[PDB]
Amino acid sequence: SMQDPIADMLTRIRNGQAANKAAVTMPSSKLKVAIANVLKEEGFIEDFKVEGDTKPELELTLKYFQGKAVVESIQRVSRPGLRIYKRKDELPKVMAGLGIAVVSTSKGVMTDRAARQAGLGGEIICYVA
Amino acid sequence: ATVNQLVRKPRARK
RNA sequence: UUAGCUAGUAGGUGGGGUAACGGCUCACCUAGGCGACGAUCCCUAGCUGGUCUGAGAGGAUGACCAGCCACACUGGAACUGAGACACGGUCCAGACUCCUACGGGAGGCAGCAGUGGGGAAUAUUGCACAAUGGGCGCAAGCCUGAUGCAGCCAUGCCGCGUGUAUGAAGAAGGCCUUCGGGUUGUAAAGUACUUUCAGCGGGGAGGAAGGGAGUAAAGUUAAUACCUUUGCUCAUUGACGUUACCCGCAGAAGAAGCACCGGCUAACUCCGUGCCAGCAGCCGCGGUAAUACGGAGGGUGCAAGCGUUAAUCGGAAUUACUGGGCGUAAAGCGCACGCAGGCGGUUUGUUAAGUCAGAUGUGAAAUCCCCGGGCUCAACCUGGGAACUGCAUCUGAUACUGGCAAGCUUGAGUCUCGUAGAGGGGGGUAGAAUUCCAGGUGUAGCGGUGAAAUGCGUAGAGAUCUGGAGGAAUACCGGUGGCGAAGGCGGCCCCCUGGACGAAGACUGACGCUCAGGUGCGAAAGCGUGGGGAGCAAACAGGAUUAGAUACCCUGGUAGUCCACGCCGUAAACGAUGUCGACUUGGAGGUUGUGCCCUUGAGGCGUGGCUUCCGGAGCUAACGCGUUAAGUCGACCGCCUGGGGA
RNA sequence: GAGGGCGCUUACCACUUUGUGAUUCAUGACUGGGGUGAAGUCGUAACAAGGUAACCGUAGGGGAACCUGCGGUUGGAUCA
Ligand SMILES: [Mg+2]
Ligand SMILES: [Mg+2]
Ligand SMILES: [Mg+2]
Ligand SMILES: [Mg+2]
Ligand SMILES: [Mg+2]
Ligand SMILES: [Mg+2]
Ligand SMILES: [Mg+2]
Ligand SMILES: [Mg+2]
Ligand SMILES: [Mg+2]
Ligand SMILES: [Mg+2]
Ligand SMILES: [Mg+2]
Ligand SMILES: [Mg+2]
Ligand SMILES: [Mg+2]
Ligand SMILES: [Mg+2]
Ligand SMILES: [Mg+2]
Ligand SMILES: [Mg+2]
Ligand SMILES: [Mg+2]
Ligand SMILES: [Mg+2]
Ligand SMILES: [Mg+2]
Ligand SMILES: [Mg+2]
Ligand SMILES: [Mg+2]
Ligand SMILES: [Mg+2]
Ligand SMILES: [Mg+2]
Ligand SMILES: [Mg+2]
Ligand SMILES: [Mg+2]
Ligand SMILES: [Mg+2]
Ligand SMILES: [Mg+2]
Ligand SMILES: [Mg+2]
Ligand SMILES: [Mg+2]
Ligand SMILES: [Mg+2]
Ligand SMILES: [Mg+2]
Ligand SMILES: [Mg+2]
Ligand SMILES: [Mg+2]
Ligand SMILES: [Mg+2]
Ligand SMILES: [Mg+2]
Ligand SMILES: [Mg+2]
Ligand SMILES: [Mg+2]
Structure with missing residues (x-):
């Protein structure tokens, strides 16, 4: 099902990057923060925020070039x-x-x-x- | 196609 | 297309046993052992360091070298000895041959060669202990078909020569030719130079260290003897060997062929032949113009070799881990449940299991790789290093995976209130229509086809009306409408019973996903037993059709279709798409709910479940798919490997 | 005397014999199909609506291609 949540994270990034979406949301975890914060420090994405403590919801800000996919x-x-x-x-x-x-x-x-x-x-x- | 399928039986060389 | 195997078998006591532990052996005791992580059975095979192929991962194999195990005509057994169940030791049996005075004995070339034979095919019945290694001995010495060598076999790899300088009316000849000219062709001849190797004569390193006879020093000893060791001197130790090497001689004199020539793939013309002959790896060439056949001319690619055949890998991503697919090209089981197996949301602690870091030990040498050295060069030999990505252990780090512990709630479940539905099973019941039967009125055709006939009917058919019987199916509603895992499921009503979906919350706390064997359902035909019988209808009856009609058409008609009880388990069982989850622009609608709203109308606004047709991005071989994917991904399983055979 | 040897006997056991199984090769009357065959005979099945739409599964039929019965599908034309 959702047995590989990192692969579910990579699916939600790759879709909204190509489909010109401004921002995406996803269920958070400890490991998903430890990957998106590295991508924030490597110029691929912009910012991430946490929302909710009983249902941790991670958000990612997309990034474009002239409307072109960075990732x-x-x-x-x-x-x-x-x-x-x-x-x-x-x-x-x-x-x-x-x-x-x-x-x-x-x-x-x-x-x-x-x-x-x-x-x-x-x-x-x-x-x- | 699945790697776990090839654990039971490998690809049969003709 | 091998699922159960095993009684000394598994374990224990005690005795015995070998060099050592032990069912290694024996009595007793227990009933276990092994096995879907392949026990057992059958077939095949010596294995490894490696070689070869390949960018690598992989792939095929195990000759020469080295390591180990097994074997020494076949089978069995023990002695001897530190070490064998013993290649040239013994004993017994069997097989084969030899010797023999007939009673007997002798023999083991898978040791070196060598013969016979097999096969496409693999060698002299050679020399030597000079060196190395080993055996015996105090040494000398002896032995060694180990090994060192030699010969044969272009069998492989590597190196060199078979000349070079110069030489154009550019001769001749051959062939092409628009007869003008080109080709062969600086190529030959001739002019100059030179001798790698072979031939012929001479000289000649190294493989050789030792060993043996005198002798001094040192050593012990009663001892200047004897012996041990270190020195020095003299005479010697080579199978290969007519050694490599080198000097000298004569003169280009002794020393180049095969395959191809349509494309792949390097090179073009001509004649002969006539789908005949032939050619050929593929494509396919040649019946009147063939660069593809045969020959000639000329050329190309190689080279003391060149072609062909057979075999392995590569090409082949054509068993796809790297690195393939399954809607229609071969392929998603007909569907569902579910064990084992694989996999698993989120938070914290712990263990350090997997993984990673460091270190030790190890991974024999040779081969390969790096830099060197050596043989005139290369092949080849060789120094050290690297490599051998392996395995074992210790010390570490804790993010991820695994285990334990405590959890959490979005996953997956539970309750209530509800709504929709041909979901299944069982029991009744209704009315048309079909056919049979009874009665009434009524008359010459009914029936059927393209046209006719078989068939029915004056015992009155058919048609109509009344009444009754039996059988099976449910018009209209009804629609890419609904339900079910699927095949499928349709009059109404009752009873029993299954899942699906929605609203509001409460609650358990990953309870989950997936599935090889196993398990059940599973269209119709058909099969078994016993009922049932209208209509339809294999086989068959009969009439047309026709060349014949077996089929078509028509009149009839049994099995079956119906029910109970089983069995059979296959379909174009199809959405020709296995299931589950996460996301990614949208419309036209349908079906089914729910929340709010001047209820101001069955409406407005939202919002879940199910479903069809369009269509963007994206994907795709094209067709098409396109929020219900065949888009981007994960979890797991099935299946395919040219067509035919099948 | 102790002890040994010979001889005899017993245990183990190769070869060897009968009874009767499992497995493998060669031979094998006959027999089951299938493939390879341009011109041979027999027919016209399928591909068009291929002249009775085709095909799959199943039962029956007959020299044969095939046909009919039941059910399914569009990998069928024409369509409303
Ligand atoms: Mg014991
Ligand atoms: Mg040898
Ligand atoms: Mg060996
Ligand atoms: Mg032995
Ligand atoms: Mg022996
Ligand atoms: Mg011998
Ligand atoms: Mg020999
Ligand atoms: Mg022979
Ligand atoms: Mg001439
Ligand atoms: Mg010479
Ligand atoms: Mg010498
Ligand atoms: Mg060419
Ligand atoms: Mg030729
Ligand atoms: Mg000709
Ligand atoms: Mg050569
Ligand atoms: Mg071949
Ligand atoms: Mg391959
Ligand atoms: Mg392919
Ligand atoms: Mg196909
Ligand atoms: Mg299916
Ligand atoms: Mg080594
Ligand atoms: Mg070395
Ligand atoms: Mg080396
Ligand atoms: Mg050199
Ligand atoms: Mg009726
Ligand atoms: Mg709780
Ligand atoms: Mg029957
Ligand atoms: Mg008929
Ligand atoms: Mg029956
Ligand atoms: Mg089938
Ligand atoms: Mg379709
Ligand atoms: Mg488009
Ligand atoms: Mg579409
Ligand atoms: Mg095949
Ligand atoms: Mg036909
Ligand atoms: Mg037809
Ligand atoms: Mg049909």
């Missing part, structure tokens, strides 16, 4: 049907280093560019292309 495509890599893990030197790049790869480690959620100074590996979340 052109995003790819869920690991999934509950097949888990993907890499080491500190087998971290894949997106568009040969242009896009970022969201990898959550013990030192929080960071990119593979940020995992060079950290020297860790773990679960690949999404290819932000």
